[PDB]
Every structure is written in C-alpha cells, then in structure tokens.
Amino acid sequence: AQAGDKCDFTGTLIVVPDVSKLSTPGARAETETEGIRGLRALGVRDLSYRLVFLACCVAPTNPTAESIKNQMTVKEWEKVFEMSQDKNLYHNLCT
Amino acid sequence: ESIENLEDLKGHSVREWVSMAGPRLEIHHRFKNFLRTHVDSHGHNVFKERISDMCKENRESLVVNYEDLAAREHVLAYFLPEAPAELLQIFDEAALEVVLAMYPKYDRITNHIHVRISHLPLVEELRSLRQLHLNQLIRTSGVVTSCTGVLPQLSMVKYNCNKCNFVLGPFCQSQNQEVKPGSCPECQSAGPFEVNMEETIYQNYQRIRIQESPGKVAAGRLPRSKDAILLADLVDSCKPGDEIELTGIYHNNYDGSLNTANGFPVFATVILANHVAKKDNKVAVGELTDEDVKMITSLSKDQQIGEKIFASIAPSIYGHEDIKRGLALALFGGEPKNPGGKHKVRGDINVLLCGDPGTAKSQFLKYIEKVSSRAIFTTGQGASAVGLTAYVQRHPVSREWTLEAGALVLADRGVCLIDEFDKMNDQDRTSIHEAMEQQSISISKAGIVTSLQARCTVIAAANPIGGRYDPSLTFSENVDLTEPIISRFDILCVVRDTVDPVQDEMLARFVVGSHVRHHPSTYGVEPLPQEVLKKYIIYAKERVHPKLNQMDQDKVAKMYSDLRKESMATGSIPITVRHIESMIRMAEAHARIHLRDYVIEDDVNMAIRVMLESFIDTQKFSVMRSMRKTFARYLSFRRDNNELLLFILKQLVAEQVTYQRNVPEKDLVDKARQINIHNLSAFYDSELFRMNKFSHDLKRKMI
Amino acid sequence: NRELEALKQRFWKHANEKLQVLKAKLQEAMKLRRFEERQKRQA
Amino acid sequence: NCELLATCSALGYLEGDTYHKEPDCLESVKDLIRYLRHEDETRDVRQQLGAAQILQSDLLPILTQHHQDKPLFDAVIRLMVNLTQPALLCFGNLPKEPSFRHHFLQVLTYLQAYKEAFASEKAFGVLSETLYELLQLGRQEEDNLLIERILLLVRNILHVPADLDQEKKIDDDASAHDQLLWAIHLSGLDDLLLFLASSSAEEQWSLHVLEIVSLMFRDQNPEQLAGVGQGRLAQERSADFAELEVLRQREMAEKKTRALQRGNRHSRFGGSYIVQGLKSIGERDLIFHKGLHNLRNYSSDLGKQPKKVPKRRQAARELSIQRRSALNVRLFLRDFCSEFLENCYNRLMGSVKDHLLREKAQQHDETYYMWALAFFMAFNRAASFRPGLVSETLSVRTFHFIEQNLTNYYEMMLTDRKEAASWARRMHLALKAYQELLATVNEMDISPDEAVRESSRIIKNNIFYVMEYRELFLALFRKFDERCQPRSFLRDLVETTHLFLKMLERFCRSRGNLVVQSEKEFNFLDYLKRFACSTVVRAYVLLLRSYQQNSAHTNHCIVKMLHRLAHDLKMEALLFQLSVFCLFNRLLSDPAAGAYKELVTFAKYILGKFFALAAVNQKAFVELLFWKNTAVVREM
DNA sequence: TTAGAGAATTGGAGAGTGTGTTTTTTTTTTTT
Ligand SMILES: Nc1ncnc2c1ncn2[C@@H]1O[C@H](COP(=O)(O)OP(=O)(O)NP(=O)(O)O)[C@@H](O)[C@H]1O
Ligand SMILES: [Mg+2]
Ligand SMILES: [Zn+2]
C-alpha cells in the first residue's frame, strides 16, 4: 500500500503503550492526560495509551511477458488470437 | 597440525563452521592458493599484478572479483554471502601474508590489508531490503545524500585505571556499543576510566546516507534511504551527489530511540561497507591493467588514430564530422598551466552546437554524458544560476549556513552539458562566466566568502532565433547570445538541415540501418569499441601531459591578426587572446589524442583548421567564398606535401641508378628526416609515387 | 490449436531472492568436485 | 575440539539421499568411542558430538545404508548407545549447581535432537530386521550382547523427557514420542517386542521388554485408550466443538459477573462513603472508596495482595498435563495393549517376578512391575473384561508384594529427606496398583462365572482378614503431605479408600467376617471411627477445595465419605471448621452450584447442624476456628 | 506413639551507596 491509495485493511485494533515510560532490565526509560499508575516497570511515571490498527491483510478497496503468459486464460488467448487474425482490425478498433 | 577437509558438509551453522579452527585454516589456505594461482583468460597471473600495483602506490587494499572467486574456489563463494565478516577477516589475513611473501618489507608500510569484494551478483534494490538480508553481504545502488567528516573511531582501546597508572589491556571496539572494562585486574576499582589516547589504536570512520537515485523508481514517490559506515581506506571513496554502487554487510542492532518512536521492538539497520564503486566512473586509471595500457599505446602507433577517434564519437550519428572532431578535442582537452606561478590559464575546451531542429545536437550531448566520466546534464529552464554554480543553505542538523556544490563544481574535472542553451534565462546563463574562463566559482553569501574550483569543460547546444538557421545572416546576427558569452566558447559549431537528395539518401539509409541494427532482438575508417575509447580517454587525460616548445609563432600571430581584420567586417567575435589560447588548447588536445608528450606542427595545423573552418561557418552564405579563399590560400590549409617527397625520391633514385650503372627506403627517409617533411606516411598512401612505379615494404625496405 | 501455439511461440520469441539460486548452482559444482575426488581416489 | 572434529569428519560424506563412507570409518568410530570413554566429568565429548550432530549426519545414514558391514555396524550400535545414554545416567544425579546443571541441560537438548532424528522409519526397520535375524539365530556372547545393545538403544531413544517448551503441542498433534511410536509400528519392532514377551525361550529379556513397554506408554491412560474405536475421530470433532462452545460461554458469563461487580462509571469517578455500623482497624468507622457496586458484595480483603509463602512451605504440583497422542497412534497402542494382554501378560509378568526373586534386577525395577500391574489390569477392566487373560497377578502374592513395596516407599519417604519426592512418586505407583487390584476384585463379582466368584471370595476373605492391608490407609492419611505429594496422589488415595470401604461394607453386611488376624474380634464401624481424625478430614477437605476441577466420580467419593463420617458416625462437629465454611461459601455462591447437588446439599446439612449448635451457645463460633481432637464430643 | 520446647539455618525488609535528570535574517524558487 502506497500513499493516496484507497485500501481495505483487515486485522485487529490494538492498544499500544507509551513505551518511553517503561524501564526494564533490558533498557532504561527514555523520558496531556493522566494515564495509569502502579507498575514496577513503570516506576513513578504514568503510562498513556494509543490505538493502532494491526493489519494482517491489505487490498485495494476496488481493483511482463511472464505475467501476461500466466494471466491470459484460454478465453483471453482465443480472443486476442481472433483479434490478431481479424481482417480490418484497423477500422474495427477505430470504431 | 590441523588436517585439510571437504568444506561444504557440516552440522553447524555457516558462521559457527567458519569460526572453528580446522575449517578456518582450510579456508585460509584455499584463499591463499586462489590468490597465488588465479589466472586471466589469456593466462596472466592476475593477483601478482594487482598486488604489485597495490604495493607500488601503497594502497593497502586488495580488490577481488566474485565472478572468478566463484570460478576458482566454489565453497569460498558459497560461504561468503552467508558469513561475510568472518570470511572477510580470514581473507584479510591470507592476503596479508601473501603480500608479505611478494614484498617482504611491506609491513613497514602497513600492518593490515583489507580484501574488497566487487561484482557481487546478489544485487538488491534499496527499498527491497528486508529481514531476510540481515547479516548477509548485499550490493545496492543509490545517490549519496549526506556524509560525515572523516572521524577517528576507537578500534583497540587501552584504558588508564581511574586511580592508578595501570593500562587495562586492549578491548576491540564494536559498532553497536562502547566497549568498557568494568573493573581493573591489578586493583578492582571500577566505573569511569580514562582512554590512553597515545597507545589506543584508532581507525578512520565516515557515515554516509544513500537514497534511491531520483530517476530510478521515485516517480513522484519519496525515496527510501539507508545509512552506511565506511572504515579504514574506504573513507573519502564518495561525496554527496555520487551515484555509487555499494557492497556491504546488512547489519542491525537494538535502538531504543526507534523503539520509543515506533512503540515496537524495532531494530535500526546500517550497511557495513566492503566496496564502493561509481556507476558513472565505470573505468578509472587506478584500475587500468598493463594489457589495457599496452593495447592503448599500440593503437596510438596507427597513423589513422585521429580519424579513428573522430569516427568513434557518437558512431550512430551520420555525418557531422566537424562536430565529432570538435567534440573529440573537447573530450580529450588541452593542458592547464600557470606560467610564472602567478597567472592561471585554463586547459579545458568549450563547445557550442548551434543549429536548426532535428540535427542530433541533444543526441550528441547525451552521447558525451554517457562516454565521459564525471559528466552531468542539464537543460534550459531546468537549470538555475544558483544550482549551476553553488548554493548556500541552512545545514539540515546544525542549522548554520553551509556552502554546497552546484553543477559546475560537481563537474570540476568533467563535462557540464547544457542542452537548449538559448532558452535559459539571462540571470541563469550569465552565472557561468567565471566558471567558463577563470575556472573558479566565487561566492560571497551569508558570511561565506570563498572560491571553489570549477575546472569544467562546458559543451552546450542551442537553436538560433526562430528555430531555423537562415544562411542570409551571420552567426552573431541570428544566435541572440552576446559577445562575453560567445567568446568564452572555444569552438563554435553550426549545423543546418539543408536539402541535398543524395546526402539525404545516405543519411536516411544510415538512420534506417541504425534502427534495424539496434533492434532489441562519412566514416570510412571504422570506430574503436566504446569500452576501448573510454579506456583511451581516461588514460590520455592522466598519463599524458603535452608540452609546448615551438608552434611557428609568426604563422599563428599573422593568422590571428588577419582573422581579427576579417572579423571586424562581419559577424563573429575572435576576442583577442581567447581564440589564440583556444588554438593552443586544441593543439594540446590533438597531441593528447595521439598520446604525444610534446606538441608538433601537425597538431598546430589541426587547431588552425578547426578555428578557421568554424569561423568560415559563421559567415553569410554569400561571403563564405571570398573568406574561404582568403584563409585557405595563405593561412595553412596544409592538406598534403607529396611533391617534395616525390622529387626527393626521384633524385635519390636517379643518383643511385647512375651510381649503379657507372636500402633505398632508408635513403628516402634520411632526407625526409633532414628536411622538415617528417610525416612520410602520406607519401606512401598517395598515388604520386605509385604512377612513378615506386612501392614500399616494411621488411625488404626497397623502393 | 497449432496456430495459437505458433502465436505463443512468436510471443515467446519476442519475450526475451537470488542467493538460493546462487547456492544451488554452486552446490552442483561442489558435487562435481566430490565426484571427481572420489573417482580419482578409487582409480 | 580439532582432533575430535578431524576424527568425526573422517567418517563419510552424504550425497543427496545416499551416504558414502571412507575406508577407515570403522577405525574412526572406534576413535569416537575412545574419546567418549575418556570424557571429562562435564561430558564434553557428548556435548561436542551432539553440537556437531554427527549422530544424525553420519551414524543414522551408516545404520540405514551400510548395515551389511557388520564390524562397522556393531561399533556404530555401541556408539549410538553411548551417545543416547540418558542424562541422569551420564551425570549420576540431577545436578544442583548452575554450571553442571547447564551441562545436563545441554546433553538433554542433544538427546531431544536424537529422539527427533530417530523417528525416521528406516532406522527401526534396520534394527528390527537385524533383531529378527538374531532371534531366529537364538546363540553366542556377541549375539546376546548385540541384542542387549539394540534393546538398550530402543530404551534410550524412548526414554528422554520431552522438552515441552518446544513440544508445546495441542490435544492430539503428533509429538516426537508419537512419531517415534509410529515409526516403531511401521518398522514392526512392536511385533518383535510381543514375540520376546510371549516367547518362553529367552525370558532374560522380559525385564528389558517390560521397560520398553513402560516407556512406550507415558501420556496414555488405559480407560481412555481402550475406548478408542474406529469411529472415534468424528466423535472427537463434535466433542471439540462442544467443549469450545461451553468454554466460551463460561468465559462470557465470568466477564459479565466482573462487569456487574464494577460500576459502569470510569475508574476515576470518585466519591467516598462511610459505613456507620462497621468499625475500621482503628476506633472510627470504615471509609470505603471503591464504589457502591463493590459494597454490594463487600469483602474486607479487596485491596490486599497474597502472602509470599516460602520455598520450603509451597505445595507440590502436577508434573504432566493430559495431551492425547495422535489418533492413529492411539489405535496402534490399543491394538498393542490387546495383543500384549492376550499373548504376553501372564508369561512376561511371571518372568519379571522370577527376575525379582533371583534378585538380578536393578534397584527399582519393581516400579515398572507395579506400573504394568496397574496399567494392563485397568485396560482389561475397560471394554470387555476377562480375568482369564490376566489370571497370574490376581494371586494374593501380588497384594503382599504391593503392600511391602508401598510401606517401604512410605518409610523411605519419611526418612530419605533428599529423595522424598521420588519416593512419593514410587509410593503413588504402588498405590495405583493396589487400587486397580481392588477394582478388579470388585469387578469380577459381576461376572457370571462361579469359579472366579469363588476366587473373588477367597481373595476378599484373606485380604480383609489380614490387618496390614486394612490399616495402610490410615497410615497414608496420617502422614500425607501436600508439600511433597501432588493432588493426583490424594485423588487416587481417596478413590482407593472409598472403593476399599465400599467392598469392606459389602463383605461385612453380606457375610459375618467376625475375626481378623491369633484371631481378634472385628466390626465395621469400629474401623470407620479410625477415620474420625482431624488429619483425615483435613486431607479430604484439601481435595474438596478443587471441586470444580475434580472429576464427578471424585466429588461423589469425597462427599460420600464425608457424609458417612458426619452422619452415620454422628460427628458433624469434627467437620465444623472455618476454612471448611469458606469452602462452603464459595460452593454455595458458585454460579455452577446446580451441577453439584450432592455437595451443596451436604454443605447445607452440616451448616444447619452448626447453626443449631450456635443457637444453643456462642461457643460454637470460637470452636469453629481451630482444628479439634476427640474432645469434639463436647460439641456433639 | 505423638506433640511441645530449645537450637540452627536461610529469606528478605530495611539502611546505605552510587547514579541520573514561536522569531529573526538570509537564501532560493516560483507565484503573481
Ligand atoms: N545525422 C543524424 N544521424 C542520426 N540520427 C540523427 C541525425 N540527425 C538527427 N538525428 C536524430 O534526430 C533525433 C533528434 O535529435 P536531437 O538531438 O533531439 O536533435 P536536436 O539537434 O536537439 N533538435 P532540437 O532539440 O530541436 O534543437 C534523434 O533521434 C537523432 O538520432
Ligand atoms: Mg535539442
Ligand atoms: Zn588502580
């Protein structure tokens, strides 16, 4: 998905903590609303939350030689072959 | 001792496997043997030559090609992209003790040698890098956007104890965190420590940012970018604006700042560089081999080398032989000089291609962009004064004013190509005056007062007023440029699409021939291959410096004086010294084309011819006859001089036959080197001695 | 369907992630090395 | 490292699906055996060879493609036996320091890798073909040595603990053990084990084959295994859907109870109340802050945390959880149980008891004996019961053997402090065998045969006449300890005690049974009053705490015994305890109280008796606080 | 045989120590 595209996302809305507030044995903390309190990892700080959509799938909302050879189904092969052999395809395509 | 093995079969991972002592020693021996036994297709021992060319210049860095490493030693090529840090360390050690076998005293010059891998086939688009590539060797391409300065980074650090004299032993510095001692073994004091700045070993460090090239995939989208780390000799391998090709290890580490920025355990990434090439400098003199030099210097022996080089410029363009000649002289260039150490004059030659539409002027500029290294291309309104010369900006992170390179500074020893030059704005077009003559760009802005070097050859293309060139007017009367900008162009070129049905047939047949020849699937001399021409140009511009000692001063002065007299009555502008120096530069350029260390009379004749033919082209169509007669008769259209050599040969034969009755090629060339007629090859390819029944043979030397 | 196949042939005439490919095509050569070593030892 | 690497890499190279061995590979494996015999105490060579995966890389291909080279093959077999040797044998005991415990874990990890590798069917195919030839031949010292080392290899590969962090596998996904058993089935080595157990010619291997069978069956229990019919897969599909449905509905109900417990206003919606009639820990009234909805079902420990009980005081926990093996493996194991019970049980068990008599068995092989005595007897009880197929272990000798083993394990548990948990696990095995023998003597009374009815009456008469089988339950209850014995031990003990008292009740109420042990008089209620002790009721209440997690039969047994002890013996005041009353409060407040009709009715009965006594006098509340000896007769 | 008093071993609560914390000028391109 790129910017400007209208896309359908499927996944789950998750809550993401303010990770800057949490100290751990792995790494220290890195420091308007109140937030929660009381955790050992949180220390004396207070933890806020934000909503993030964890998308497991993305698709558009309305949708090479190898690619053409794979995509072309038998009806499409017959159609393009008949068009190639169509006499006066010039005027037919113009019209 | 540890025993040799089949390497490719093991139960360990690749990193663990090559870390173990047995296979490490086997890999070491294999790479040593590969260096000491690899040969070229012709049988030349490649790495003996490369190591000698390294140890001569003290470059302390050995470039190895993957595409023949895979040919010689399979398993080394197998393990290399999988465990690159370990294998490259082993390669460094093996290469070091090969180099100390070839040059035993080279440890005085350097104690460590880096193996740099080139032509890695697993190339990757810069935005296509994923977690699958982590800790593996990759190759990517992109434009360098930012560079730090060259900084000293700790590599083997010794710490002074915080409370006593003791030096805590060497810690190997990492790119992930600052290694630390904890507490001293002589006395267990702990915490802060002092670095021993004298005994600590440092290494060069430079961090660059590279992003996708603007024309590659960023079609209105923002480009992706990666950071890369250059260490030791790789620093100063590139600058901002360089379209580099980077090989390196895709390395990742924990970054708390990214973790708090994203709210997830996101790891920062960086490319530990192992080789930096450039996609415009596809060939360089530091990479030329002895065979390349040999075949270049063999080509220079041919008397047709000037015609071969002229025919070799833009070979898919029919005709325009004068244009190809002028572009060759500009592409090779003259010799810069500073007589007295107080008075600079440029060596570079500037060209202007004026003419009507559909005449391959822009196509010529595109060809010059492709063939020449350090070339750039710009067009009309797309260019600006500031972008052409140099620009002052708030630095992105410091926010202090910094000067930055423009077009003519990025092409400081290359070619700046300015297409549709007539259509620029005047404020944009007048910005290149200092760069075009004084070859500096002087900036006095925002507290910056300095002058940058711009030793650039400007090749420009333009249309006349109204698009179509009219022969009824002189060049000055229909070009719309002024004298200060016209006179800075050493070579003026006029191309006209006038109707001539036979020439139109020849041109059209050649164009159709090019279209059918290049399907995806006036020359008379055959060109060089373009790879050979690139090698020839880059050799000639560095390994040759033509000197000037005598050029027939009175001839050139007389020529220039009556050229000024005729120009006073008509419409092109030989400003006093610039045209004299244009001729000097063109003579030096012709000597450079022939790989001559000293300028000769033939080169001077060629320069005079170029100047005069360009001047005749700028005249009105009615005036060309009188002007051409004026310069052609007196001012040295020295086509050929066969009659003197014919009668010298006939005199020598008459004396010899008279002597015989009562080695003649040596007798001929002795008198030819006595009299100033030394270019005897024209006499042998001319019919004058042939209808007099004379002939030549390099073996028998009888005539 | 022979003419349709001929059109496909004309289309293919005009018709004109890689670490694993490299490893496989290289492992073929290493297999050849093992075979030649085995044959030379057993000869 | 380097010399070991050179010697192991010297063996052979693998080409695609084929293995080519170097000519000195025999001497190479001999060198590897030499290094293994001269390991350090850290088992360094075993660690290094496991890290190198030389077994999987070299020895398995050599086994499966070069078994014809017999001098190489037997050396390879011995090398694999040495490599696959269990870690407890490698180190002697489970270490107790970080470094050696790490070494133990590393060796164990490589054993996991070996077990995962040996599931390839070709290995056991070659082993079964070889052992088929050997048993056709059976005889030499080298031949029986090779048979012993093949059987020890199978024992070793079966006996590894599964690393359930990596084998974190769902209800009937095939574990590594399942795949190993399926490989054994496909190779047909199960038929060779059945031949060894059924044949009388080579009974010295019967003990080893018993060990192999005991290691084959570890996740399974006979009652579930015997019921695996051919159409069980469709049934289990519907059962899984039903179980998911009821689990989800239960969770939703629990969520709604929590939601109604707290208010519908946000957490910081303040306001504080005073409860005028309720003193705080000071002299003033309590001030409550958590809202009216928390006051609606007020508890005086809402804000408190649990206590950190010390390590030496913490209760024991279950070492296993009932993941089923894959359904195909379950079908194969049911067929194996059927063929073993039909063709193999009597002769093998007689041979193993003969081995115990000859006293050449190892120090705890009767644990395997009692395992089989529980397992296959219970398998016979499940589905069509036939004592004729299992007649040997119905002898009174087995009851005496179990009793002496159980009392020995009991004494060693009470004395051998450092190994008390393992002695508890051995006592649990003995108790399970005793329970299953009580079950089968109960079962055969329902059978139509007068001969086995006579045998049942004989067994019941001598077992209830001999006192030491009778007093053992009081001994176990009096010295039961949750700190050492898991809840499954207490569950099995309660089930066994209920069954034993049921059979004793029936025997005394249908026949005189007037004397016991030197005869001395006996009546049934005299023995039942022995269980009227504080420790016994305490243990029964301890099992009653998990009434939701208990099986329905366990709840029936516990409530039946407690109702007997309270009502028929008229000692309700013994069961008056405040912890017991907390248990009843949770039981009555349970939303699922309708599913426990007998338990809730018993709770209401005993509570009514208590409140009668409380209406008589206020002393009942104080007496309710403390556990109580025979002075309870004051309250009654 | 079962239960209470004196002595021994180890968990952890608490004290101390070390460390961490809009607004102005100048340029550049494009908008009129
Ligand atoms: N002599 C020639 N030989 C081959 N191709 C030619 C020749 N003259 C013109 N062309 C073709 O004409 C096309 C236009 O070239 P181009 O360089 O854009 O012309 P131009 O001189 O720039 N005209 P203009 O941009 O209007 O000033 C290209 O495809 C050239 O290859
Ligand atoms: Mg153009
Ligand atoms: Zn010190």
Coordinates of all heavy atoms in Angstrom, one line a residue, chain B residues 129-159:
Chain B
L129 N 15.2 -4.1 0.6 CA 15.9 -4.8 1.7 C 14.9 -5.2 2.8 O 14.0 -4.4 3.2 CB 17.0 -3.8 2.3 CG 18.1 -3.4 1.3 CD1 19.0 -2.4 2.0 CD2 18.9 -4.6 0.8
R130 N 15.1 -6.4 3.3 CA 14.1 -7.0 4.3 C 14.9 -7.6 5.4 O 16.1 -7.6 5.4 CB 13.2 -7.9 3.6 CG 12.3 -7.3 2.5 CD 11.2 -6.5 3.1 NE 10.3 -5.9 2.1 CZ 10.6 -4.7 1.5 NH1 11.6 -3.9 1.8 NH2 9.7 -4.2 0.6
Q131 N 14.2 -8.2 6.3 CA 14.9 -9.0 7.4 C 15.6 -10.2 6.8 O 16.5 -10.8 7.5 CB 13.8 -9.4 8.5 CG 12.7 -10.3 8.0 CD 13.0 -11.8 8.1 OE1 13.8 -12.3 8.9 NE2 12.4 -12.6 7.3
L132 N 15.2 -10.7 5.7 CA 15.8 -11.9 5.1 C 17.3 -11.6 4.7 O 18.1 -12.6 4.6 CB 15.0 -12.3 3.8 CG 15.5 -13.5 3.0 CD1 15.3 -14.8 3.9 CD2 14.6 -13.7 1.7
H133 N 17.7 -10.4 4.5 CA 19.0 -10.0 4.2 C 19.9 -9.7 5.3 O 21.1 -9.3 5.1 CB 19.0 -8.8 3.2 CG 18.2 -9.0 2.0 ND1 16.9 -8.7 1.8 CD2 18.6 -9.6 0.8 CE1 16.5 -9.0 0.6 NE2 17.5 -9.5 0.0
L134 N 19.5 -9.8 6.6 CA 20.2 -9.4 7.7 C 21.5 -10.3 7.9 O 21.5 -11.5 7.7 CB 19.4 -9.5 9.0 CG 18.3 -8.4 9.2 CD1 17.4 -8.8 10.3 CD2 18.9 -7.0 9.4
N135 N 22.6 -9.6 8.3 CA 23.9 -10.2 8.5 C 24.4 -10.9 7.3 O 25.3 -11.8 7.4 CB 23.9 -11.1 9.7 CG 23.2 -10.5 10.9 OD1 22.2 -10.9 11.3 ND2 23.8 -9.5 11.5
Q136 N 24.0 -10.5 6.1 CA 24.4 -11.1 4.8 C 25.0 -10.0 3.9 O 24.7 -8.8 4.1 CB 23.3 -11.8 4.0 CG 22.9 -13.1 4.6 CD 21.8 -13.8 3.8 OE1 21.2 -13.2 2.9 NE2 21.6 -15.1 4.1
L137 N 25.9 -10.4 3.0 CA 26.5 -9.4 2.1 C 25.6 -9.1 1.0 O 25.0 -10.0 0.4 CB 27.8 -10.0 1.6 CG 28.9 -9.0 1.0 CD1 29.5 -8.2 2.1 CD2 29.9 -9.8 0.2
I138 N 25.3 -7.8 0.8 CA 24.4 -7.3 -0.3 C 25.2 -6.3 -1.1 O 26.3 -5.9 -0.8 CB 23.2 -6.7 0.3 CG1 23.5 -5.7 1.4 CG2 22.3 -7.8 0.9 CD1 22.4 -4.7 1.8
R139 N 24.6 -6.1 -2.3 CA 25.0 -5.0 -3.2 C 23.8 -4.1 -3.5 O 22.8 -4.6 -3.9 CB 25.7 -5.5 -4.4 CG 26.2 -4.4 -5.4 CD 27.3 -4.8 -6.3 NE 26.9 -5.9 -7.2 CZ 27.0 -5.9 -8.5 NH1 27.6 -4.9 -9.2 NH2 26.5 -6.9 -9.2
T140 N 24.0 -2.8 -3.4 CA 22.9 -1.8 -3.6 C 23.5 -0.6 -4.4 O 24.7 -0.5 -4.4 CB 22.2 -1.4 -2.3 OG1 23.2 -0.7 -1.5 CG2 21.6 -2.5 -1.6
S141 N 22.6 0.2 -4.9 CA 23.0 1.4 -5.7 C 22.1 2.5 -5.2 O 20.9 2.4 -4.8 CB 22.8 1.2 -7.2 OG 23.6 0.1 -7.7
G142 N 22.7 3.7 -5.2 CA 22.0 4.9 -4.8 C 22.9 6.1 -4.8 O 24.1 6.0 -5.0
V143 N 22.2 7.3 -4.7 CA 22.9 8.6 -4.7 C 23.3 8.9 -3.2 O 22.4 8.8 -2.3 CB 22.1 9.7 -5.3 CG1 20.7 9.9 -4.7 CG2 22.9 11.0 -5.4
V144 N 24.5 9.3 -3.0 CA 24.9 9.7 -1.6 C 24.3 11.1 -1.4 O 24.6 12.1 -2.1 CB 26.4 9.8 -1.5 CG1 26.9 10.1 -0.1 CG2 27.0 8.4 -2.0
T145 N 23.5 11.2 -0.3 CA 22.9 12.5 0.1 C 23.6 13.2 1.2 O 23.6 14.4 1.2 CB 21.4 12.2 0.6 OG1 21.5 11.4 1.8 CG2 20.6 11.5 -0.5
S146 N 24.3 12.5 2.1 CA 24.9 13.1 3.2 C 26.2 12.3 3.6 O 26.3 11.1 3.3 CB 24.0 13.1 4.5 OG 22.8 13.7 4.1
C147 N 27.2 13.0 4.1 CA 28.4 12.4 4.6 C 28.8 13.2 5.9 O 28.8 14.4 5.9 CB 29.5 12.5 3.6 SG 29.1 11.7 2.0
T148 N 29.2 12.4 6.9 CA 30.0 13.0 8.0 C 31.4 13.3 7.5 O 31.8 12.8 6.4 CB 30.1 12.1 9.2 OG1 30.7 10.8 8.8 CG2 28.7 11.8 9.7
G149 N 32.1 14.1 8.3 CA 33.6 14.2 8.1 C 34.3 12.9 8.4 O 33.7 11.9 8.9
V150 N 35.5 12.8 8.0 CA 36.3 11.6 8.4 C 36.7 11.8 9.8 O 37.4 12.8 10.2 CB 37.6 11.5 7.5 CG1 38.4 10.2 7.9 CG2 37.1 11.3 6.0
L151 N 36.3 10.9 10.7 CA 36.4 11.0 12.1 C 37.3 9.8 12.7 O 37.2 8.7 12.1 CB 35.1 10.9 12.8 CG 34.1 12.0 12.4 CD1 32.7 11.7 12.9 CD2 34.5 13.4 12.8
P152 N 38.1 9.9 13.7 CA 38.7 8.8 14.3 C 37.8 8.0 15.2 O 37.2 8.6 16.2 CB 39.9 9.4 15.1 CG 39.4 10.7 15.5 CD 38.5 11.2 14.4
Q153 N 37.7 6.7 15.0 CA 36.9 5.8 15.8 C 37.9 4.8 16.5 O 38.8 4.4 16.0 CB 35.9 5.0 15.0 CG 34.9 4.2 15.8 CD 34.0 3.3 15.0 OE1 34.6 2.6 14.1 NE2 32.7 3.3 15.2
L154 N 37.6 4.6 17.8 CA 38.4 3.6 18.6 C 38.2 2.2 17.9 O 37.1 1.9 17.5 CB 37.9 3.6 20.0 CG 38.3 4.7 21.0 CD1 38.0 6.1 20.5 CD2 37.8 4.4 22.4
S155 N 39.3 1.5 17.9 CA 39.4 0.1 17.4 C 40.0 -0.8 18.4 O 39.5 -1.9 18.5 CB 40.1 0.1 16.0 OG 41.5 0.4 16.2
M156 N 41.1 -0.5 19.0 CA 41.7 -1.3 20.1 C 42.1 -0.3 21.2 O 43.2 0.3 21.1 CB 42.9 -2.0 19.5 CG 42.6 -2.9 18.3 SD 41.6 -4.3 18.8 CE 41.3 -5.1 17.2
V157 N 41.3 -0.2 22.2 CA 41.4 0.8 23.2 C 42.0 0.2 24.5 O 41.6 -0.8 25.0 CB 40.0 1.4 23.5 CG1 38.9 0.4 23.9 CG2 40.1 2.5 24.6
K158 N 43.0 1.0 25.1 CA 43.6 0.7 26.4 C 43.1 1.8 27.3 O 43.2 3.0 27.0 CB 45.1 0.6 26.3 CG 45.6 -0.5 25.4 CD 47.2 -0.5 25.5 CE 47.8 -1.6 24.5 NZ 49.3 -1.6 24.6
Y159 N 42.7 1.4 28.5 CA 42.1 2.3 29.5 C 43.2 2.5 30.6 O 43.6 1.5 31.2 CB 40.8 1.9 30.1 CG 39.6 2.0 29.1 CD1 39.1 0.8 28.5 CD2 39.0 3.2 28.9 CE1 38.0 0.9 27.6 CE2 37.9 3.3 28.1 CZ 37.4 2.2 27.4 OH 36.3 2.3 26.6

